[PDB]
């Protein structure tokens, strides 16, 4: 018999049933893609693209669909806020249905390859035994991969035939699927440059086509063939797994640090954008530029877009959720319905205090209001029986200069303390916590979930590659050395 | 190779020289493991002895300043440096060694050389197992310390703000890192960490039980009172009574091992699985995806002033760790918090 | 084969090790006592921890100008 952890080894020396199980896995993955897309379309709310975007709704595969071109659905809506033009066959639901039909076709092909496994194509003509010319198969596959890479980089993303990719504002205000001109200079290696993706795919496709032709025409040496066990499928398994978790570590890194292939409007903001004050600095720069030239306060802040203030909010932080805080970000702290405004605090005699913002490491943070120079002037104290920093004796007042609260000044009650505590989380926003029966604790972004899943899978596949490389270098002792 | 002429090149001579029995085995892996490991241990011993941490952390962590072995450490760079690789030739140090030591570059040196030394060491395990024609289960077991090192010293700081939040190479530094994970991450509450704790404790239990059982079933094999000299490697018989051991543990514990294969595979399996689960948990913590709270418990205690559990006590303790540790822990944050906003109990 | 038992017993080992080991010990002693450890590894002296301008813990707070800044706030 066989152990439960060895039942898949029956197709090691069976190329036809290996193709069958690869087709079965491929069918399962395509069917998951279609079913997941249809689930996210069913649970998606496209009413508010600005204040309730897809990354706030826990959408996982919709940002990846969007990134390569599909924007509108069969329901007549588009994620950009525009009402849909003709979607053709390639909408969200159309792509999902195409994946489902592909899954069924791959299932049927898997059944055919399971039944018809003893094909003469898998038989060696020289010896009659079953064998695979793995260097030639690799050359063919590398040629096809280079052709796909070159086509995707020269026709799809450049827009000469395809739609392009998602290009957005540096602060994620305006973004859309557009054609992208390739960047062939050093700027093409800028990770946030969208032009580096078509140039990369064109050059890598050309080089992959050349290397595939080289492997098609040139046989490996005997020393390298015996050293890497090129006649064995377990060795190529180990090498392929190695390349796969290398790519998994790379995609997890680019996911966590952001890139041109990782739009903010699709995957949410970044924890480094929160820590480094990206949106906060841009908001303050816009307010300073408007106040220095013309427009005064309470009308300059009205020039601040609703989306930027939503980006400057720690509840949108991907490094703020929990491992078992499951679900959408809306289910965490409600659906955002409006921006209350910029809470500005003044002393009793008059000087602008600032609430110290919460870092990502802190589940909770003390509420302090400190001076322009950098000295603590007030706080919401824990002990409430000492010093000259409690709110009720410093006498700070919150003014607000935004949407729902534009000139409503509060000075006396504990509403000042409540607004200070809300201001330590960034821009104060109004949330509806009754539609989804929201929890209260912050959830994680799809960016954070993608990064966690891929890093965990990357280490697990490091172990898998180490085990498989062990097994393919040590085949003689894993099977038996026969008393020698 | 494979019944071929195989005219010799430089590679055959190099392989013949490297794969020789010596006082210490070198091999091809020794081209990486020996320099990388020597540089890692030497850099750690140098940083613990002479290199200060006054610039980066604002603290003394070296023997030249008055620190012990349990106290001196090779400290991480400053958080404003981010995830900079901190090369000597890099834009930070700019080829200046005595400021590269002051900038925390020795931590990056030791960490990268230790990672490549671990790579070279498990390559050496592979090479020696291939030379003696044995299965590389030692390498498979050593994959778990490498995973722990990668997830702790690389993946977690790459997920965080910078190398500053990585473990500094030391003893009290590691204790700081551990208490930081308690206060900020609630790392004891993480099920992956619980699996890792179970793996290590079960592995120590297995080691003690197996050693005691073998030493207490040792057969006679001699006449002297010292059983250690009763052992002969030439004989083909087992040195201990597996039947007696199985019956003893079956009547003591209820279950016992019947296969030495399964016994030693379990001894291999338990700590490796535990360390891999703990590595996955630290990867989860790298993005602050922590099992910090129980939502039902916190809502119950929010609407009930009577409901208290040891978990609520732990949450309250974590709050104090964060509040009283952040000000002197993270000098970049510039947390000049007054004493009244810091939480206190009664009278302490 | 010199199995590390005969060499430690022989006087040929200790004739050449009555100079090398004490010389290394004295070299380390002078390396510390001459301030060369401070000069090479950048550790501050006990009198060189706080300059007149700053009396608190130093902060690097910069990356691309870290060399210039640490030269600025070091002990001259």
């Amino acid at each position: 018999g066989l152990p439960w952890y060895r039942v898949h080894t029956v197709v090691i020396n069976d190329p036809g049933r290996l193709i069958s199980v690869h087709l079965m896995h491929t069918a399962l993955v395509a069917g998951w893609a279609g079913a997941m897309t249809l689930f996210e379309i069913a649970v998606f709310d496209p009413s508010d693209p600005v204040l309730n975007p897809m990354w706030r709704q826990g959408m996982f595969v919709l940002p990846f669909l969007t990134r390569l071109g599909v924007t509108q659905s069969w329901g007549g809506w588009t994620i950009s806020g525009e009402t849909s033009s003709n979607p053709g066959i390639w909408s969200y639901e159309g792509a999902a249905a195409s994946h489902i039909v592909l899954s069924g076709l791959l299932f049927l092909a898997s059944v055919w390859h399971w039944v018809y496994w003893d094909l003469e194509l898998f038989r060696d003509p020289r010896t009659g035994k079953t064998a695979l010319d793995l260097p030639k198969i690799f050359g063919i596959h590398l040629f096809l991969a280079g052709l796909l890479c070159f086509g995707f980089g020269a026709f799809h993303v450049t827009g000469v035939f395809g739609p392009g990719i998602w290009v957005s504002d540096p602060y994620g205000l305006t973004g859309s699927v557009q054609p992208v001109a390739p960047s062939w200079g050093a700027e093409g290696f800028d990770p946030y440059n969208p032009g580096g993706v078509p140039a990369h795919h064109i050059a890598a496709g050309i080089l992959g086509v050349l290397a595939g032709l080289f492997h098609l025409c040139v046989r490996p040496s005997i020393r390298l063939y015996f050293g890497l066990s090129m006649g064995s499928i377990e060795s190529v398994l180990s090498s392929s797994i190695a390349a796969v978790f290398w790519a998994a570590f790379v995609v997890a890194g680019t996911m966590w640090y952001g890139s041109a292939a990782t739009p903010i409007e699709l995957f949410g903001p970044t924890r480094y954008q929160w820590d480094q004050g990206f949106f906060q600095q841009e908001i303050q720069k816009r307010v300073a530029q408007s106040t220095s030239e013309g427009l005064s306060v309470s009308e300059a802040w009205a020039k601040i877009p609703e989306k930027l203030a939503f980006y400057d909010y720690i509840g949108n932080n991907p490094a703020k959720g929990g491992l078992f805080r499951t679900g959408a970000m809306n289910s965490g702290d409600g659906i955002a319905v409006g921006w209350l405004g910029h809470a500005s605090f003044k002393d009793q005699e008059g000087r602008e205090l600032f609430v110290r913002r919460m870092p990502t490491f802190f589940e909770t943070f003390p509420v302090v209001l400190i001076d322009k120079d950098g000295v603590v002037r007030a706080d919401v104290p824990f002990r409430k029986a000492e010093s000259k920093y409690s709110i009720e004796q410093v006498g700070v007042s919150v003014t607000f200069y935004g949407g729902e609260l534009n000139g409503l000044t509060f000075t006396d009650p504990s509403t000042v303390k409540k607004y200070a505590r809300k201001a330590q989380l960034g821009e104060i926003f109004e949330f509806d916590r009754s539609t989804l029966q929201s929890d209260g604790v912050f959830r994680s972004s799809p960016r954070g979930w993608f990064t966690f899943g891929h890093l965990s899978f990357a280490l697990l596949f490091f172990f898998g590659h180490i085990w498989h490389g062990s097994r393919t270098i040590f085949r003689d002792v894993f099977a038996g050395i026969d008393e020698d | 190779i494979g019944t071929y002429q195989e005219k010799r090149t430089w590679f055959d001579d190099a392989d013949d020289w490297l794969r020789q029995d010596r006082f210490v085995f070198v091999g091809w892996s020794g081209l990486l493991l020996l320099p990388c490991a020597y540089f890692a241990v030497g850099g750690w011993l140098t940083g613990c002895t002479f290199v200060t941490s006054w610039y980066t952390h604002g603290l003394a962590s070296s023997y030249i300043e008055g620190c012990n072995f349990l106290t001196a450490a090779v400290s991480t760079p400053a958080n404003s440096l981010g995830h900079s690789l901190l090369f000597v030739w890099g834009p930070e140090a700019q080829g200046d060694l005595t400021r590269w030591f002051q900038l925390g570059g020795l931590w990056a040196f030791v960490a990268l050389h230790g990672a490549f030394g671990l790579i070279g060491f498990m390559l050496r395990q592979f090479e020696i197992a291939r030379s003696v024609n044995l299965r590389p289960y030692n390498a498979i077991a050593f994959s778990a310390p490498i995973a722990v090192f990668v997830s702790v010293f690389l993946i977690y700081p790459l997920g965080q703000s910078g190398w500053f939040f990585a473990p500094s190479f030391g003893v009290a530094s590691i204790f700081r890192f551990i208490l930081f994970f308690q206060g900020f991450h609630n790392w004891t509450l993480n099920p992956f960490h619980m699996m890792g704790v179970a793996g290590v404790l079960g592995a120590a239990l297995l080691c003690a039980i197996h050693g005691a059982t073998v030493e207490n079933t040792l057969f006679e094999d001699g006449d002297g009172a010292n059983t250690f000299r009763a052992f002969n490697p030439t004989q083909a018989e087992e040195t201990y009574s597996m039947v007696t051991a199985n019956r003893f543990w079956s009547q003591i514990f209820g279950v016992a091992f019947s296969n030495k294969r399964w016994l030693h595979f379990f001894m291999l399996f338990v700590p490796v699985t535990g360390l891999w689960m703990s590595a996955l948990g630290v990867v989860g913590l790298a993005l602050n995806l922590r099992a910090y709270d129980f939502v039902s418990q916190e809502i119950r205690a929010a609407e009930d002033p009577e409901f208290e559990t040891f978990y609520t006590k732990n949450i309250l303790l974590n709050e104090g760790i964060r509040a009283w540790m952040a000000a002197q822990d993270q000098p970049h944050e510039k947390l000049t918090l007054p004493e009244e906003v810091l939480p206190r109990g009664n009278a302490l | 084969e010199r199995p590390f038992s005969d060499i430690l017993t022989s006087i040929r080992y200790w004739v050449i090790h009555s100079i090398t080991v004490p010389s290394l010990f004295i070299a380390g002693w002078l390396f510390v006592s001459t301030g060369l450890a401070y000069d090479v590894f950048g550790s501050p002296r006990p009198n060189e921890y706080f300059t007149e301008d700053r009396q608190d813990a130093p902060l690097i707070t910069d990356r691309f100008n870290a060399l210039e800044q640490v030269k600025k706030l070091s002990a001259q």
Binding site: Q280, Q281, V355 | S80 | -
Partner: peptide, 27 residues
């Protein structure tokens, strides 16, 4: 406009800002 004021404007709320961590030698 006022790069000195906006740097001090973001000084109290957040000490980890890029605008602070860059060109901090002159301050």
């Amino acid at each position: 406009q006022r790069v000195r004021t906006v740097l001090d404007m973001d000084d109290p709320a957040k000490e980890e800002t890029v605008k602070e961590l860059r060109k901090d030698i002159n301050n």
